[PDB]
From a paper:
The prefusion [name]-[name]-2 S trimer is composed of S1 and S2 subunits separated by a furin cleavage site.
Thus, we observed a modest decrease in the 3-[name]-down state from ~56% that we had reported for the [name] spike, and the appearance of open states (2-[name]-up and M1) that were not observed for the S-[name]-[name] dataset. The variation in the S2 region was unexpected because the S2 subunit had appeared relatively invariant in prior studies. The triple mutant and B.1.351 spike structures, as well as ΔFV 3D-1 and 3D-2, clustered with [name] spike structures; the B.1.1.7 and ΔFV 3D-3 structures clustered with u1S2q; and ΔFV 3D-4 differed markedly from all others. We can infer from these structures that in the virion-associated spike these changes could have an impact on spike stability, possibly leading to premature S1 shedding.
Residue numbers in the entry:
A (entry chain C): 548 to 596
B (entry chain A): 27 to 68, 80 to 143, 165 to 172, 186 to 245, 263 to 620, 641 to 676, 689 to 827, 854 to 1147
C (entry chain B): 854 to 1041
D (entry chain B): 745 to 794
E (entry chain C): 696 to 744
Amino acid sequence: GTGVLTESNKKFLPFQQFGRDIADTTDAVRDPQTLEILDITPCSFGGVS
Amino acid sequence: AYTNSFTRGVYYPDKVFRSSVLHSTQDLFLPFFSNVTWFHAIDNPVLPFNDGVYFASTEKSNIIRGWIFGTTLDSKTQSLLIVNNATNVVIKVCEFQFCNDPFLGVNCTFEYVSFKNLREFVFKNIDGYFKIYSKHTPINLVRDLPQGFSALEPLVDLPIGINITRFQTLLALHAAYYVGYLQPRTFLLKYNENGTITDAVDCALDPLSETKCTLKSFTVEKGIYQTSNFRVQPTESIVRFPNITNLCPFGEVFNATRFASVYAWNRKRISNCVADYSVLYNSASFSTFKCYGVSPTKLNDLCFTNVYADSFVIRGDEVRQIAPGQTGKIADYNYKLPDDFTGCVIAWNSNNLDSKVGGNYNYLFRLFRKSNLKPFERDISTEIYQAGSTPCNGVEGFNCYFPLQSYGFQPTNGVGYQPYRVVVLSFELLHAPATVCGPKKSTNLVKNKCVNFNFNGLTGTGVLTESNKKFLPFQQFGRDIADTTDAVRDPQTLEILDITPCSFGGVSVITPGTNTSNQVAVLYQGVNCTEVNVFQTRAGCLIGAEHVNNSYECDIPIGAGICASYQTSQSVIAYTMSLGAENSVAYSNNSIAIPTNFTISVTTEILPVSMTKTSVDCTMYICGDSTECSNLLLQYGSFCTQLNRALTGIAVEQDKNTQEVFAQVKQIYKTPPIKDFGGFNFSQILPDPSKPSKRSFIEDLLFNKVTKFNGLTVLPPLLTDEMIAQYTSALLAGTITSGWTFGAGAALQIPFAMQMAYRFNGIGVTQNVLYENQKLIANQFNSAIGKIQDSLSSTASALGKLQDVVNQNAQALNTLVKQLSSNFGAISSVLNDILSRLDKVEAEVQIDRLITGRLQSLQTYVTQQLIRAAEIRASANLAATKMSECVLGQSKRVDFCGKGYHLMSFPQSAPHGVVFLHVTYVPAQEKNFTTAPAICHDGKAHFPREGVFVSNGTHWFVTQRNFYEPQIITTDNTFVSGNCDVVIGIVNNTVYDPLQPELDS
Amino acid sequence: KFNGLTVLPPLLTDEMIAQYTSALLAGTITSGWTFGAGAALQIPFAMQMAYRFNGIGVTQNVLYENQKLIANQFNSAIGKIQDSLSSTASALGKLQDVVNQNAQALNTLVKQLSSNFGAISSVLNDILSRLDKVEAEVQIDRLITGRLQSLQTYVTQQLIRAAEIRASANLAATKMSECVLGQSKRVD
Amino acid sequence: DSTECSNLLLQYGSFCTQLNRALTGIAVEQDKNTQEVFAQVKQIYKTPPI
Amino acid sequence: TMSLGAENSVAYSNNSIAIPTNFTISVTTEILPVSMTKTSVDCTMYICG
Ligand SMILES: *[C@@H]1O[C@H](CO)[C@@H](O)[C@H](O)[C@H]1NC(C)=O
Ligand SMILES: *[C@@H]1O[C@H](CO)[C@@H](O)[C@H](O)[C@H]1NC(C)=O
Ligand SMILES: *[C@@H]1O[C@H](CO)[C@@H](O)[C@H](O)[C@H]1NC(C)=O
Ligand SMILES: *[C@@H]1O[C@H](CO)[C@@H](O)[C@H](O)[C@H]1NC(C)=O
Ligand SMILES: *[C@@H]1O[C@H](CO)[C@@H](O)[C@H](O)[C@H]1NC(C)=O
Ligand SMILES: *[C@@H]1O[C@H](CO)[C@@H](O)[C@H](O)[C@H]1NC(C)=O
Ligand SMILES: *[C@@H]1O[C@H](CO)[C@@H](O)[C@H](O)[C@H]1NC(C)=O
Ligand SMILES: *[C@@H]1O[C@H](CO)[C@@H](O)[C@H](O)[C@H]1NC(C)=O
Ligand SMILES: *[C@@H]1O[C@H](CO)[C@@H](O)[C@H](O)[C@H]1NC(C)=O
Ligand SMILES: *[C@@H]1O[C@H](CO)[C@@H](O)[C@H](O)[C@H]1NC(C)=O
């Protein structure tokens, strides 16, 4: 993927690997080595009008 | 013993955090309010497990310590055993037998290690993954499971492969426990702010739970909600064919030794006999059975009028030509299948039968002809063929040949030059009756009941019925306008049947809103009750409602004049709807009613105007930054540039819709420091300084009650919500301080009490009826504004049309977004997943299924958004016409500017729309009076200039049509015409003369 | 109408529609425009018509003076409606057109179940009863793609037609409000 | 009324449910059309004996 | 940042009115499209050429 990775506050339960927004899209993730809980803010974009 | 499961035993379906959201899935879920079997710390029987188990024990001191699982628990196959001690979990798989009915004391192919308290678990195996979910809580009721909801968290998830349909629990020996069973069910899950499940819905419990799941919601509003179609099942299945005498000649066709050439093929007939085609298609006698448009298993399901064994020898290389679409010397000049051939061909190596030492030449093929033969044709001439210009004169040479050849079949040729036998099954498979059929002999014939059927190979499902549809002696089917089957005739008995269609209609749930009740009723649209409390109506069968002999006004509309509501001991009644009360109007040739007092209503109307602008960047949405899809999407030409053009034309017309509605005012007018408006309290509808945006107070109630990244972009409006509010402020400030004059020119100020008197003349109620009631009318307007504030504060359901439009657009996008998860027949629905799986041609096919699907989905979205934009534009042209005619004007168009005779409207901005406060006059104190079309005087007929003649019962007056101001009838509120004799229904008053009291002075 | 094409009844039965057209008509007759703007205020029918003469700038005495004539002209015109309806196909063009269009759209939707869309047969059961597994499912996916594209075409055509019938129902709701419940000043 | 086709049709997502929503929206709108045309009246007024 | 047109304090009071002494007979032009080129793309000859 491509986007703005960040640390995040979202309260992942100890078995949870990923997190999602309302419309079923990846929105937060876990680091596999360190178990850091991360946002995925989207890659910034738009029209060149 | 047995007791309730309640709403409990619910667990996290997948390892994905979600929050503040009502997610849903099919899974094994515990059916709400199913039984649980109850047990005591005394006994551990072996129990069923079904698809999955909800288990719990209640202890102060932990007596349950483990479980044993499998289909049988027999230790003949490996059985799973598990032990839990709250600090740890232990897992074992075994066949080496312990105690035969076990407890825990106070070929073993796998092992692993990690009343006061209710210790809860859910156990399931799916796809070989055995999963434990768990929870713990204090409880107060000793005897039964609790009634407050909780959700269960995973302890174990292992691909052990041991599937389960029984279990036995393990007691600690030298308290109680319970068991309920999961079922494959759709369910709804209330994930809270902290990613925790806090409530659930069992979609398959009851009609209200089917409604809750249809709406993906825990609250449900009062209404009728469609759910699945009631497809009435066929009760039985029918087979009919003619019967027949012989058994098929397959030994004489296939075990007999003889065979022939392909230019001069042989034939034998399969007819007049029962068959089993597996005697051919499972036979060891053959090397191959080529079926085209057919699988050979079907030959015993089919039935045939005849089959012909069109049979010949060719060499093993040339068998390739015996297929549809092929050409070459056998298919060209000897024997041919049709290029649309549906049926089969038997082939085998016949070197064991047809070869001879020195090479056999007695089986032959044609080498040349002027043109190819037709399918199934034969041709036997032997004269020398010519293609060279120098003639052949009875001998071979350069481009001169004898027209037949043969292969020289030695018993030791290479396989391509060995003989092969071929039998083409030339079918006579028809709508005509069979003379050959498999094991499927006839059933009985079933009537006036919906059934599956087969007659001679015509098949379907329906209600077979006897009918007067008399076929001519050769006719065998009957059909209607659209070529649907309508009648048939039986093959054994020549009797006539009508195939009446089987039964279906949408099961629809009638409910009061969940906060008032959970009692419910169920419509079956048009279905007959004999196929389904139960009750019948013209719109179909109606379960669970109370049929009422009275008739209320409608509430939830059911269909064909039936409505339903929640009323008394309370019940969901259903009734023949009163279309209101049957008011027999107190009419006669002299009866009038003239109203003696009014009210002023302030009926709120709401209009959508500008749905949320979007652009969907057609490449980013369809392709997800793929280079591969960025290329493939070019194949479709200017497809994306026209979808992006369509959405841009929609988006520009939203700015246009908002400009056409709100920007009808050429200056931002603003209201004065002093609010000297003669009683009308606008401080609720005019701007509020006490906010970051200068909305009015009522606009701020409106803005409270009305409620992204996948290449979708929600582009801003051109006018900000504060600019839209500056326009509704300018509109409203003009509307208050200048009346209608600001639409037709420069705003001309006028005092609002005087504007309201203009608004009275525009309803034909003379404007003294305002001012001579001015404070009362101001209090009716102010009180109606109070009712509006109270309504909008209490009744979030009041702004139906805008919240509907916001929900339509949010549902349209939730469709377009969740369609990104749909496969459309691709390997995956995620495109960077496709491209991290796949490469080159292999990717490009699957990417093109997603391009086709996402393009069709984006086109469907764009097409419905174009039609919806045409609806919103009709509503915005309507709202721009209510802005021109009701705000910038006063409309004479009946019921255009709200019910009653409209006085004026105020725009209030609202999210993606507008609100009009239609102030209207409504008469409210009716009375009976005597009337006449005209009044006689000096033998002259008189008619009123404005209004109607009236009498209380003894004295004669005239009044405006809409308010009883009885005035003495005079030569200046009347006009003469002609004389009394012509005038059917005239009456004999005297009209007064306003010069007479001056003549008499 | 029988391949899952369920026709659903109107909420109001034809009898209830007749009770509403009767209420509208009995209101109109006995009370005029008043029943739209309140409760029905009764007024004699000759007088309810003298209101209607003022709403076209004809001074209302012209009605009461020509009352018997105007009644016979209305009755004779009602007889001509009966005779027009007792003869002429082009009397009710628009409704027999709408019934025929809905029936044509449905007959198209049903005969499209007889169209191949490039599949080996149009009868779904033929594929299911001669092809096994993935090859059958590919031919079925051609039939789904074609029937789904034809159902999308039907529903799209019915959305565009519902926008036309809604433009006509909004026109008839407007003619009910302005012509029956009122008297429209709007030319033609 | 068949199993294989019904499960292949799922792959297309909310086409079916938005087609049933479109036809339901058309169908409810035909009652709304009929209600907004004819039900412009609160009481079933009815005529005199004479 | 855009103008919405000139801001104006309307000269309001319970006794203030404005009346126009003169007019302009604005011959406004409104253009409404009514038809379009009557295409009939024969699907047969277009799709199969
Ligand atoms: C449910 O409990 C009742 C006793 O209340 C019992 O008769 C019935 O057989 C039980 N059914 C199931 C499926 O557990
Ligand atoms: C639970 O079992 C483990 C061994 O699997 C043991 O180490 C642990 O001490 C036990 N805990 C208790 C409370 O007995
Ligand atoms: C142990 O299990 C295997 C199958 O995993 C089976 O073949 C074998 O017969 C079993 N051992 C005995 C002693 O039967
Ligand atoms: C959510 O977690 C916070 C602490 O992070 C806690 O204060 C709050 O009470 C929790 N709310 C719920 C509903 O779980
Ligand atoms: C065969 O069909 C005839 C009618 O065509 C019927 O009379 C006869 O009983 C049938 N025989 C059997 C065994 O079904
Ligand atoms: C639901 O009922 C409670 C009282 O039982 C009430 O406080 C609440 O306002 C109601 N809400 C709705 C939407 O009916
Ligand atoms: C339902 O079927 C019965 C016969 O089974 C019939 O008498 C009844 O008329 C049917 N219902 C309707 C609404 O016609
Ligand atoms: C309706 O009421 C009458 C008596 O008032 C009774 O004869 C009739 O059977 C009732 N019908 C139903 C369906 O309740
Ligand atoms: C009007 O008079 C008639 C006289 O028969 C009576 O039936 C009716 O109830 C009266 N209506 C009112 C509103 O007074
Ligand atoms: C008015 O109607 C009554 C009967 O309802 C009748 O007696 C009377 O003659 C009628 N008026 C005229 C002018 O004929």
